[PDB]
Design a protein around this ligand. Sequence first.
Ligand SMILES: [Cl-]
Ligand SMILES: [Cl-]
Ligand SMILES: [K+]
Length: 164
Amino acid sequence: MNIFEMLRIDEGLRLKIYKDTEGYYTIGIGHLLTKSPSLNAAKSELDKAIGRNTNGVITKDEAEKLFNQDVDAAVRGILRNAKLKPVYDSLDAVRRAALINMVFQMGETGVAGFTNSLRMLQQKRWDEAAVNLAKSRWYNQTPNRAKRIITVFRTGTWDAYKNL
Ligand SMILES: [Cl-]
Ligand SMILES: [Cl-]
Ligand SMILES: [K+]
């Protein structure tokens, strides 16, 4: 298991524009196109991202290309964030993947707002961090996924993704 395989499981792979769990146009492996309700606006974003005039459909290789970019961007964002960097640096590789997953799903900003949870993770207070993480709109809106992420921060293992 690794961050790519983990997010491939959480996000799935769809080659045609679809709406994410929040109702936003997206494509590939969780690549958010826009928050706009205009499908045309979404298609415009898709073409700019791929570099060609698409028919709202991309190839697997193109989906993977955007995914690679997206994962790198999430890591990059963590490293640039004063609230997230310290926590990330304090973690082991498995838990770091859990944090990257959260940032890919919610954005740097979103994650940096989990102040209390972040502090517990940095203190290595696993069970308490787990309980705190669950007290969120994130957990309530995407409970199955949140539960997997929380178990990885709790245990430092990939067991939650075993058999998916
Ligand atoms: Cl992009
Ligand atoms: Cl979920
Ligand atoms: K998705």
